[PDB]
Design a protein around this ligand. Sequence first.
Ligand code: Y08
Ligand code: MN
Ligand code: MN
Ligand code: NA
Length: 304
Amino acid sequence: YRYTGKLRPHYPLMPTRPVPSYIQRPDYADHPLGMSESEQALKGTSQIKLLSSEDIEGMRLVCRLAREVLDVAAGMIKPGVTTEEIDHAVHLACIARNCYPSPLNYYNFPKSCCTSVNEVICHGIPDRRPLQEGDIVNVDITLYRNGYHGDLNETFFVGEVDDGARKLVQTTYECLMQAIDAVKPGVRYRELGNIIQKHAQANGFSVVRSYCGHGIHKLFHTAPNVPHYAKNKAVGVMKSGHVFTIEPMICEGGWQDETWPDGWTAVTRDGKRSAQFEHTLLVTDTGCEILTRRLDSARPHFMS
Ligand SMILES: CO[C@@H](C(=O)NC[C@@H]1CCCN(C(=O)C2CC2)C1)[C@H](O)[C@@H](O)[C@H](O)/C=C/C(C)(C)C
Ligand SMILES: [Mn+2]
Ligand SMILES: [Mn+2]
Ligand code: NA
């Protein structure tokens, strides 16, 4: 394997972390390959669930707890902290909230959250690498509570970063928020990618094609697919009661990704940096409710 930049995995990984049996588990938690039979039963349907009153409450709850966990991880981002240490804090914070960390054993994903540094696009595996001054690091949190998943992420700065990092991160965050601003009943899912690419391109950046936002609720990933690039052929039209993520990954260089020999870590083929933000949204009559927003602060963590 020829690495595409300077990042390397730092092994060994700590043994899988157990989750106490009192915490309610998703179906894939105990499947030996991490397969979700409730997602597989739905494999090739385009049908989007219309959430009940009760579903919305379950989503509001899990997404708020998820935000709380992401904020814990935010507090830990500094030079010399390892991504495994961040993941341990996350795993304990989920447990404190009587939540299962949804990534844990999801298709045999080995950790409780994803930590993506610099050229990693997404799905990096927490490991022994200490964060370095100048890094940009994304923490991607997903929680499972009472049958519902809530999924969000942010990119953070590790100490002082260069100007390119500041611009990449800022534009990525703008991309997500312009897409969120367009959400409202009657809009097609395929439109969001147009908005995203239009803004990333205006700032000299590209859009990852190989990973999409997605419906989420009782399933971790389900219809609609939500591509982030222009002229995609995504199916479906937003209606009040739809819940899904938007989670654009934007890159300094070209859009092409490849995966590490670990089968998870996705990286730019050119080794240039990539940044991401994600929220879980519910479509309402006036537009949308950002279920994973901050409640107590105006801005994402990187702005402060
Ligand atoms: C960028 O990452 C997103 C992403 O892979 N989306 C695409 C969907 C991923 C799973 C497979 N897909 C499906 O539709 C199939 C129905 C299951 C595509 C993902 O949702 C992240 O936001 C999430 O936090 C990470 C989850 C792992 C535990 C998988 C690391
Ligand atoms: Mn996520
Ligand atoms: Mn997601
Ligand atoms: Na990255």
